Amino acid sequence: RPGGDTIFGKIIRKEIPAKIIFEDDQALAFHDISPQAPTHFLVIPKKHISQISAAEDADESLLGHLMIVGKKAAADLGLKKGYRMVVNEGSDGGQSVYHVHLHVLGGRQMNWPPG
Amino acid sequence: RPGGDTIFGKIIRKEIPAKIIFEDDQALAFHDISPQAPTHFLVIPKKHISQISAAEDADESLLGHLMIVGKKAAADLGLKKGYRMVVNEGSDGGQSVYHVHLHVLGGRQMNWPPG
Asked: Where does AMP bind (chains A, B)?
């Protein structure tokens, strides 16, 4: 199915709404349901890539596009003092939903280590 | 100067060594000096992009290439249970060195929030 078979596939197909902040032909950005910072949103590809370890070389431009969308949406939301981008891979990374998703977090100082 | 004028430019030009684990015509990966996980390395572009908010649309493929290099190097290092990728932008993101760098952390459960 276009958009894949996870929670995110229903968002991509518009079956279930989300707090959408950016949309193009490649990607969607929307506010995260469990925010960990004053701004916390996800950027996802419309194409169903399960996890970053399943991305192929021909996906490079799309993966970079997720970062450029994250930069643009962070600017629209008025981040001026920066943000952190996070991609979780597999169990140790903390990934639960097996569709690639880039987190963008800002509006506070982000700490270290990053989890 | 090729590789730019930060700490990372001296690594790219091989003026100062680093624990290099992957190298191609676009990018370099090397172990981080201040590791926060049993595996913690950086992937950097050879081209000097100061920060993710300064990346241009034509940089998408290179930005995605940093993620594919991170996937490949994480596999070479034997991560099997996953990892987390992190890009810090500006002061709130925790960026100190103004040359794009992707962290890849694994070999332990990564926590939440990610800082």
From this structure: 32-33, 88, 94-96, 101-103
